[PDB]
């Protein structure tokens, strides 16, 4: 615990924010609480569908949610059977009219959240941590990424003593801010305890 969050340190330069709405002191707390509620609802409902990111905006006292996911067909439904329900519940929670947008995440193996969730699912399904890490690293390195690092910590293999294992392939410069670093974490709850997974992906430096 001596490392800083790359996504939090690259907010100003490269990485965008997950919430681009404006308010004042009187509304900031309420907006953050509503965003937390809707994010908790979405991450609990769309668990099967590979969901990557949720951006929230509040223009003209209305809420615009944009879900970047890898399974738009099952996220939406047959002809709007689930997206309409999601819009209705989001509008009911926020007290304002809602507009939901869907974005497709091409190359799902290059997204930190999806890979971390897959690793967590495999760990809770009793798949080998080393095998999962090697498969994920190889897939992410062959689909066109310039570097990947995967770390797994805590009660590996049902042992009585925790440990921290990790794999690296390529280059993952964390001290370079202009570098396009995608980082995320995940937690698996197995009968032997809790296991933490962290993923860093490098997508090339940015100029501008």
């Amino acid at each position: 615990g001596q490392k800083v969050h790359p996504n939090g340190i690259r907010l100003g330069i490269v990485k965008p924010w997950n919430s681009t709405w404006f308010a004042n002191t009187k509304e900031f707390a309420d907006n953050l609480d509503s965003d937390f509620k809707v994010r908790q609802y979405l991450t609990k409902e769309l668990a099967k569908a590979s969901v990557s990111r949720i951006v929230i905006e509040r223009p003209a006292k209305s809420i615009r949610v944009t879900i970047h996911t890898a399974r738009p067909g099952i996220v939406i439904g047959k002809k709007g059977e689930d997206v309409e329900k999601l819009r209705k519940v989001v509008a009911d929670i926020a007290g304002v009219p809602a507009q939901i947008n869907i974005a497709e995440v091409r190359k799902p193996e290059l997204d930190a959240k999806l890979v971390a969730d897959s690793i967590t699912s495999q760990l809770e399904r009793r798949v080998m941590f080393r095998r999962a890490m090697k498969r994920a690293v190889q897939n992410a390195m062959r689909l066109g990424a310039k570097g990947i690092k995967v770390e797994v910590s805590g009660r590996l293999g049902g042992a009585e003593i925790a440990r921290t294992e990790w794999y690296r392939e390529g280059r993952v410069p964390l001290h370079t801010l202009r570098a396009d670093i995608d980082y995320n974490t995940s937690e698996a709850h197995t009968t032997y305890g809790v296991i933490g997974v962290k993923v860093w992906i490098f997508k090339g430096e940015i100029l501008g």
Binding site: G8, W17, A29, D33
Partner: protein
Amino acid sequence: AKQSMKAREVKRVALADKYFAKRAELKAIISDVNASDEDRWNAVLKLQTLPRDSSPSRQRNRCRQTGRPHGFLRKFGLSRIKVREAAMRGEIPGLKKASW
């Protein structure tokens, strides 16, 4: 924090919002310079009979996620740990660590 603590906080908020006007009237009567010396006494007599939870001074500001009383920030409505956790991921707009 604790479900009991959160229930106490929400009950106190509801009572304060219910009895805000009645207590304000009594406070105005007490603070009024030109008022009956017996009416001003009956004002405090009636005021001290109201439930103590109906006072804004008895409700503590906690985190809307956990309920931690210490480290609370009013603008964000969360504790210091949760504010940092949200900022590092980007849920809070324009909250970037800087230097000068």
